[PDB]
Design a protein around this nucleic acid. Structure first.
Ligand SMILES: [K+]
Ligand SMILES: [Mg+2]
Ligand SMILES: [Mg+2]
Length: 186
RNA sequence: UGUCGAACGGCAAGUGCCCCGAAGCCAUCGCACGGUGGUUCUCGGCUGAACGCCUCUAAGCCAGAAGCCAAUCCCAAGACCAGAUGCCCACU
């Protein structure tokens, strides 16, 4: 076993990270994010003066050590979301039948996917904002915006996964809703 | 057909036989009715290390089978209900 294993992250000036009982909360401009990591059993320290977030594993094997970088990446993702946010752009690609997507408040309705008469409905949580880009700029583009990367994604995936071609060749019939660009909003 | 003398009333033929027949019973031979959530498989994904990259996983996640579990439905306290009540009586 390894007596000490560390992972250190640098906290920007705007954001403040607070840890208490393996419960991380990152608060800055644009919002506040919270993660529960009580299943991990690591030593999480925050140096406010030096703006550092350290995660330590004492007497750990490879399996416990593998969680240090995962925790560091999670905290980095929350810092990035609190600072600049996350924006996922998905595009409706089709060969013959146009895929008509209507976006109400937190509601997405997909119609005429491969000519089907069934309407696909998706409810988006209030923490993720869904919009539709007007066709003059880019055709059939839906934008998901939010602080949580794990919440901005998943929504873009429940939209991709609901429009799946069934009982047909997937080399042919390439139509669907695909995530094209992942970026930020600020 | 027999038989009370005939008619009437019947009667015997272990319900004499034939036709129609209520009520009841009964026929996919008639008619009515036959519901809802979860947890998950397989799978496909998300975020993400190990392993500066990668990766559905490894810690987490998301979806998700006529399986499975509950609801509904049938029996139900030896499931010993200090559930609630109506009257007496005992105690008081
Ligand atoms: K008859
Ligand atoms: Mg007779
Ligand atoms: Mg006689």
């Amino acid at each position: 076993v390894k007596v000490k294993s560390l992972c250190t992250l640098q906290i920007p000036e705007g954001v403040t990270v607070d840890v208490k009982g393996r419960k991380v909360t990152v608060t800055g401009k644009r919002g506040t994010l919270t993660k529960d990591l009580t299943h991990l059993q690591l030593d999480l320290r925050v140096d406010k003066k030096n703006r550092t977030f350290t995660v330590i594993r004492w007497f750990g094997s490879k399996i416990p050590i593998a969680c240090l970088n995962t925790t560091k990446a999670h905290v980095q993702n929350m810092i990035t979301g609190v600072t600049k946010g996350y924006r996922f752009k998905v595009r409706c690609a089709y060969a013959h039948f146009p895929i008509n997507v209507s976006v109400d408040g937190q509601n997405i309705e997909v119609r005429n996917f491969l000519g089907e008469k069934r309407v696909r409905r998706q409810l988006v949580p209030n923490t993720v904002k869904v919009s539709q880009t007007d066709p003059s700029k880019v055709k059939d583009e839906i934008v998901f915006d939010g602080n949580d990367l794990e919440q901005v994604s998943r929504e873009a995936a429940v939209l991709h996964q609901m429009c799946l071609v069934k009982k047909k060749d997937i080399r042919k019939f390439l139509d669907g809703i695909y995530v094209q660009t992942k970026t930020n909003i600020e």
